[PDB]
Enzyme design. Sequence first.
Site, short mmCIF file in Angstrom:
data_model
loop_
_atom_site.label_atom_id
_atom_site.label_comp_id
_atom_site.label_asym_id
_atom_site.label_seq_id
_atom_site.Cartn_x
_atom_site.Cartn_y
_atom_site.Cartn_z
N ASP A 256 2.58 0.89 -7.57
CA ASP A 256 2.11 -0.30 -6.35
C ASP A 256 1.89 -1.41 -7.28
OD1 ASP A 256 2.11 -1.31 -4.08
OD2 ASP A 256 0.08 -0.23 -3.62
N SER B 32 -6.03 -4.91 -0.21
CA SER B 32 -5.03 -4.30 -0.96
C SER B 32 -4.40 -5.45 -1.91
CB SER B 32 -3.68 -3.84 -0.32
OG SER B 32 -4.10 -2.67 0.54
N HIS C 24 3.28 -2.94 -2.21
CA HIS C 24 3.43 -2.70 -0.79
C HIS C 24 2.76 -3.74 0.17
CE1 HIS C 24 -1.00 -2.01 -0.70
NE2 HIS C 24 -1.00 -2.25 0.53
#
Lengths: 30, 242
Positions: free
Chosen positions: B99, B190, B43
Amino acid sequence: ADCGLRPLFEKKSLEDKTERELLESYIDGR
Amino acid sequence: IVEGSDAEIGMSPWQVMLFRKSPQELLCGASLISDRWVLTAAHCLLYPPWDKNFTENDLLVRIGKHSRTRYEANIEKISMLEKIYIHPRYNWRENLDRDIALMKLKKPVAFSDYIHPVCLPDRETAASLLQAGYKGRVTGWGSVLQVVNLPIVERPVCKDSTRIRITDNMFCAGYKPDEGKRGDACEGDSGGPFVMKSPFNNRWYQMGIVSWGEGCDRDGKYGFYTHVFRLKKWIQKVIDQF
Ligand SMILES: CC(=O)N[C@@H]1[C@@H](O)[C@H](O)[C@@H](CO)O[C@@H]1O
Ligand SMILES: [K+]
């Protein structure tokens, strides 16, 4: 091969300031 | 990272910062797994709802950093990307399942006291270390690299904490409200690594990739991580085929 062994820590037989907490969780966490 | 502390120099030599080339923007964390491959979250590179779809030329990675803003001459290495590989079944529409993404550097980076690869788990390491109550470590940024150790949470507790459907490709970690401690990796972190130190061979293994949460460091909510070992076959396939 040499992965996961840090030059300034494992390679010099020095422990960082909080890794002891991770190792203790193997005894105390479960 | 919130509620963590300053990392010591060289404490996370596999740490990588993924930057938008221009305008300059720290997009996500990432990790060095060999002299030419960097692991991150899909992402961070591809998210259609926001029109996010970076190409190799849109980014740079900074390896070996300790300072958030200063250029660390003769310590850090800034690399360009040769190619980006996103997991083919990365599910952005529902819950960020799978992810994960790989980035091949244009040129190999030389290792140093500040730049060194983390190991990827094998089945034995995944089974022995990925257990609720055991603590892993997450790193990222707030003036210096931050670190926080967090416990893996029981899958039922993870699932009951959110309305999102959790898959076998994710796990969650963080302190529960009755544990007296805090700390969490945030959206900005992230793509960064959740690592664990094996009490058997003393090596650090990257067990997770910071993937998503519903508000950083919130009581009764947990950070979710891509289960790296579940996806190791895909990683090996990409690296072997290139
Ligand atoms: C958002 C979207 O449609 N995906 C695009 C895909 O079409 C294109 O081939 C690729 C180039 O590497 O970038 C993105 O993956
Ligand atoms: K929490």
